[PDB]
Design an enzyme around this catalytic site. Sequence first.
Site, PDB file in Angstrom:
ATOM      1  N   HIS A  55       0.800  -1.218   0.000  1.00 13.29           N
ATOM      2  CA  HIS A  55       0.000   0.000   0.000  1.00 13.29           C
ATOM      3  C   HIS A  55       0.837   1.273   0.000  1.00 13.29           C
ATOM      4  O   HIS A  55       0.277   2.382   0.032  1.00 13.29           O
ATOM      5  CB  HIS A  55      -0.999  -0.043   1.163  1.00 13.29           C
ATOM      6  CG  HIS A  55      -0.415   0.166   2.530  1.00 13.29           C
ATOM      7  ND1 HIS A  55      -0.341  -0.845   3.467  1.00 13.29           N
ATOM      8  CD2 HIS A  55      -0.026   1.296   3.165  1.00 13.29           C
ATOM      9  CE1 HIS A  55       0.122  -0.354   4.603  1.00 13.29           C
ATOM     10  NE2 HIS A  55       0.329   0.942   4.444  1.00 13.29           N
ATOM     11  N   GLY A  93       2.952   5.644  10.047  1.00 12.07           N
ATOM     12  CA  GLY A  93       4.273   5.479   9.481  1.00 12.07           C
ATOM     13  C   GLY A  93       5.049   4.284   9.995  1.00 12.07           C
ATOM     14  O   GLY A  93       6.214   4.121   9.610  1.00 12.07           O
ATOM     15  N   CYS A 112       4.197   1.150   9.343  1.00  9.28           N
ATOM     16  CA  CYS A 112       4.067   0.023   8.431  1.00  9.28           C
ATOM     17  C   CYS A 112       5.421  -0.362   7.844  1.00  9.28           C
ATOM     18  O   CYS A 112       6.307   0.473   7.603  1.00  9.28           O
ATOM     19  CB  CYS A 112       3.077   0.335   7.305  1.00  9.28           C
ATOM     20  SG  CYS A 112       1.383   0.259   7.946  1.00  9.28           S
TER      21      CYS A 112
HETATM   22  C1  LIG Z   1       1.122   2.035   8.125  1.00  9.44           C
HETATM   23  O1  LIG Z   1       0.895   2.561   6.845  1.00  9.44           O
HETATM   24  C2  LIG Z   1      -0.212   2.293   8.880  1.00  9.44           C
HETATM   25  C3  LIG Z   1      -0.081   1.942  10.397  1.00  9.44           C
HETATM   26  C4  LIG Z   1      -1.396   2.160  11.175  1.00  9.44           C
HETATM   27  C5  LIG Z   1      -1.699   3.657  11.396  1.00  9.44           C
HETATM   28  C6  LIG Z   1      -1.984   3.853  12.903  1.00  9.44           C
HETATM   29  N1  LIG Z   1      -1.702   2.555  13.497  1.00  9.44           N
HETATM   30  C7  LIG Z   1      -1.379   1.550  12.584  1.00  9.44           C
HETATM   31  O2  LIG Z   1      -1.104   0.428  12.890  1.00  9.44           O
HETATM   32  N2  LIG Z   1      -1.263   1.462   8.237  1.00  9.44           N
HETATM   33  C8  LIG Z   1      -2.449   2.037   7.745  1.00  9.44           C
HETATM   34  O3  LIG Z   1      -2.642   3.218   7.857  1.00  9.44           O
HETATM   35  C9  LIG Z   1      -3.524   1.096   7.057  1.00  9.44           C
HETATM   36  C10 LIG Z   1      -3.413   1.169   5.529  1.00  9.44           C
HETATM   37  C11 LIG Z   1      -4.376   0.254   4.800  1.00  9.44           C
HETATM   38  C12 LIG Z   1      -4.241   0.332   3.292  1.00  9.44           C
HETATM   39  C13 LIG Z   1      -4.235  -1.200   5.224  1.00  9.44           C
HETATM   40  N3  LIG Z   1      -4.865   1.412   7.459  1.00  9.44           N
HETATM   41  C14 LIG Z   1      -5.244   1.290   8.769  1.00  9.44           C
HETATM   42  O4  LIG Z   1      -4.609   0.650   9.568  1.00  9.44           O
HETATM   43  O5  LIG Z   1      -6.353   1.948   9.153  1.00  9.44           O
HETATM   44  C15 LIG Z   1      -6.552   2.200  10.538  1.00  9.44           C
HETATM   45  C16 LIG Z   1      -8.008   2.360  10.919  1.00  9.44           C
HETATM   46  C17 LIG Z   1      -8.580   3.743  10.612  1.00  9.44           C
HETATM   47  C18 LIG Z   1     -10.072   3.882  10.893  1.00  9.44           C
HETATM   48  C19 LIG Z   1     -10.869   2.899  10.083  1.00  9.44           C
HETATM   49  C20 LIG Z   1     -11.112   1.674  10.533  1.00  9.44           C
HETATM   50  C21 LIG Z   1     -10.574   1.129  11.827  1.00  9.44           C
HETATM   51  C22 LIG Z   1      -9.839   2.195  12.668  1.00  9.44           C
HETATM   52  C23 LIG Z   1     -10.401   3.579  12.353  1.00  9.44           C
HETATM   53  C24 LIG Z   1      -8.333   2.121  12.398  1.00  9.44           C
END
Ligand SMILES: *[C@@H](O)[C@H](C[C@@H]1CCNC1=O)NC(=O)[C@H](CC(C)C)NC(=O)OC[C@@H]1C[C@H]2C=CC[C@H](C2)C1
Lengths: 300, 297
Positions: free
Chosen positions: A39, A141, A143
């Site tokens: 992603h 950040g 990931c």
């Molecule tokens: C790394 O890019 C990032 C790490 C996340 C951000 C905060 N904590 C983490 O572990 N990963 C992401 O942002 C994910 C990207 C997609 C394409 C898999 N998305 C993600 O983790 O979304 C977090 C959600 C946001 C919102 C919607 C649904 C469930 C919660 C509220 C958490």
Amino acid sequence: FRKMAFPSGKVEGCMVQVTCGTTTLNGLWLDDVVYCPRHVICTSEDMLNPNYEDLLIRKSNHNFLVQAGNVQLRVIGHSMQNCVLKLKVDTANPKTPKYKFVRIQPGQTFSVLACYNGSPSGVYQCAMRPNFTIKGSFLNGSCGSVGFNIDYDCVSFCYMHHMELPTGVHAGTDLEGNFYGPFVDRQTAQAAGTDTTITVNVLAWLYAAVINGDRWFLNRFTTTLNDFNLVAMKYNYEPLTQDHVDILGPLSAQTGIAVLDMCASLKELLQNGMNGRTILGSALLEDEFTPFDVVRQCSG
Amino acid sequence: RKMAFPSGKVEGCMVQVTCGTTTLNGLWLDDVVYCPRHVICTSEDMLNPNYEDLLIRKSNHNFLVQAGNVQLRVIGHSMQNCVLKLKVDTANPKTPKYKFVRIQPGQTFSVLACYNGSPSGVYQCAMRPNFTIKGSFLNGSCGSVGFNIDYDCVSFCYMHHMELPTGVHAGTDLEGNFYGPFVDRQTAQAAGTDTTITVNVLAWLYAAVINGDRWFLNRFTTTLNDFNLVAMKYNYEPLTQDHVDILGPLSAQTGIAVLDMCASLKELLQNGMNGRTILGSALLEDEFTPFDVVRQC
Ligand SMILES: *[C@@H](O)[C@H](C[C@@H]1CCNC1=O)NC(=O)[C@H](CC(C)C)NC(=O)OC[C@@H]1C[C@H]2C=CC[C@H](C2)C1
Ligand SMILES: *[C@@H](O)[C@H](C[C@@H]1CCNC1=O)NC(=O)[C@H](CC(C)C)NC(=O)OC[C@@H]1C[C@H]2C=CC[C@H](C2)C1
Ligand SMILES: [Cl-]
């Protein structure tokens, strides 16, 4: 007992950052390949419903910024394997350790090197839950941070971080990009199944208690594996596998307590409770120490 | 989650030091190796070692220093308090930027546990109020060090020397001065009464809130002095105004006044957790500092 991580230096030497547009995350640089979550090619708006194959066709090698610190590594090839990107670079990492890619089982523990912008922040021990989530400390950040075990000289990479779930726990893939559990890399609502207690680790903890002379809970009964598994499931404990019975083998040999006798002891704790007592200073049974972790700490 | 600093910069400094039949770890910075002085003792010496007298009787060549498969030649040796300083003819290329610091009780640090100069594991400790640390250390772990990393600079604050009968651990700063009333002699030693690091319990309750967990909060409030009377009763350290100040950002972030969290902690002490758990624990955790929680949040 402490949650004790593996020394992280061999993994620190492999962390880089990968940027596409303004999307930056971490990657793992081994020999002349950088591994990272796919992603990275998504705009924040594309994460809502990405078509990764279409997104990737629009990308060329020169759209990928790979940096070790602030030193660019030229990308000379790219391919997508499940949910990970493989970027071929023109420099072999001189800090590449001896390594393996392994897919772990629920219950297994590993160290996570939390990174941001390709820079290590911290290291901690995680257990893969039976519902294939981990209770991590991941911020934006993070990931591409990886989880690993070290056996002798060899780093076994088992986890790459991709996402947070509504409930605050975390989900990701192995290093071939196959998610642990029923999750997808889309910015959508996903739920993990109800979690359960890691029975093999509780048994390891009971063995640990015995090694340290705390053994009031040992009883004079045994059980079959099947009878134990059917009871345990009624208390939201995982059933044991044949591999679980095997990996308890060393602790059973050390203490002289057969695995199935320990299971019978645990069954009584579940059916009657602690009756006000403690084990290793706690009224709670701990389920995040594997049989290896117990050995590691009791003689390493 | 209990999070240690990345240990790579420290791993590149660990060597093995051997004198006689005794092997432990040393820390190799520039052309000097630091290690516990009790490496020069024998079983006999253990009990009342006159270290200056045992040291004058050793030669440079009595010290075998090994960095991996490579022996480093000792060209000089001196003792600073309870640490031995071995001069070697080779400079460690992997020496990080570093400083030696002596930490305060209630501060935290990461430990890199080593055996035979090889890293085994890394974990987070706090300097207890009674100047012990609750570590995981076995035979051969002496010379393992504790540290913090700020920027690219490693601040070494702890070198490991001993275990107590209760299972906790004691050691020195990198000037070789013990934390606490302990002595590097092979005897059973007790510590002072341990107390709980209150500012850290409060930091960790704020952490639980920041992660959506607030069952322990209450509508009540307390004064600082009235809270400190209750804390002292339960063998908690008193909370100073600087602690209260230090807790500001967590208070602001959660919108929970420090003294309101103190009222929550008071309720927990007087009634218990009544079965419930906080951030996964049936006990109040006191080995996260406010800074620890912040950095990870
Ligand atoms: C790394 O890019 C990032 C790490 C996340 C951000 C905060 N904590 C983490 O572990 N990963 C992401 O942002 C994910 C990207 C997609 C394409 C898999 N998305 C993600 O983790 O979304 C977090 C959600 C946001 C919102 C919607 C649904 C469930 C919660 C509220 C958490
Ligand atoms: C490093 O050399 C070693 C590390 C110890 C061993 C086991 N766990 C540790 O942390 N340090 C020592 O062995 C100490 C050397 C002396 C000269 C300072 N001694 C020591 O730690 O002794 C342990 C005491 C005494 C002994 C007998 C009764 C109770 C326990 C065992 C505690
Ligand atoms: Cl000499």
